[PDB]
Design a protein around this nucleic acid. Structure first.
Ligand SMILES: [Mg+2]
Ligand SMILES: [Mg+2]
Ligand SMILES: [Mg+2]
Length: 152
RNA sequence: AAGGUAGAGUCUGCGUUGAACACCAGAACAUAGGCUUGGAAGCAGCCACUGUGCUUGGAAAGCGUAAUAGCUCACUGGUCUAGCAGUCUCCGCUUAUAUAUGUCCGGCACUAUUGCCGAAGCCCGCCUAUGACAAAUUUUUUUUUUUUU
């Protein structure tokens, strides 16, 4: 992590926004992805404009405390094509965790954003970290705790 | 149509006088019950279903042998000891072989007789065209019958 703490501090995006930190301990990937999508679009702001791309810098820690309920570790797949004949590639969720474990929440947030050309800028602002610390230690960052889970 | 697919709605064959499965297993005599066949010995084809001491043992579901047997299932005392079925009814997902370029819930995801959103409907403001209906208390305002031989 000698240079990984350096590269994540290199910012391409606009920075008039607010930084958010979310602990993903015990959170279901779908509901956390819904809340992260709402924060990323900037619709938690009274000054929201559909044309203007505001939002928040969402930082997620503990990406491997994230669970997939009802045997979706072996049955949920991730499929794409290569453009070549026979190019269907389907990866299971356990193999997706064993390849890159932050991609579960990454793809879940990607499927919930609006499908336009502002999606690249919104997916920049989602920074998902597997372990419990992030490079933005000294930053002024405001925590987003979700509403309590016990509706059931 | 089909499987120990599950969640719920009633009477009941079981069953705390030792219980389905799980455990020690008693598991038989005149006999090899009567025809055939070389042998038909609990059972190739078939006919019979005599008794017996019985808490139990079917002429007997069977691997099986020239067949007895090598083994046992079913029927019953106790062990385990609170176990406990299969008859009726739906439901959220299933099974029945080519989506044969590349995913078939739209994707991502998830194990309310009314509050709100929601249309060019309806109401409100303004405008246009064509139709109707409504509205918009002092009359009189002067001017001629005639005349000249
Ligand atoms: Mg109305
Ligand atoms: Mg109207
Ligand atoms: Mg008019």
């Amino acid at each position: 992590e000698a240079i990984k703490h350096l590269k994540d501090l290199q910012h391409i995006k606009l920075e008039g926004l607010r930084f958010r930190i979310i602990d993903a301990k015990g959170q279901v990937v779908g509901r956390l992805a819904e809340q992260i999508s709402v924060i990323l679009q900037g619709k938690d702001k009274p000054t929201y404009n559909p044309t203007k791309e505001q939002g928040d810098v969402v930082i997620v820690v503990n990406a491997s405390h994230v669970e997939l309920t009802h045997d979706k570790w072996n049955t949920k797949l991730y499929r794409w094509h290569t453009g070549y004949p026979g190019g269907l590639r389907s990866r299971p969720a356990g193999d997706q965790w064993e390849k890159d474990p932050r991609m579960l929440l990454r793809n879940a947030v990607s499927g919930m954003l609006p499908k336009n050309k502002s999606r690249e800028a919104r997916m920049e602002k989602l920074k998902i970290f597997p372990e419990a610390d992030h490079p933005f230690q000294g930053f002024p960052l405001v925590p987003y705790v979700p509403p309590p889970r016990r509706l059931q």
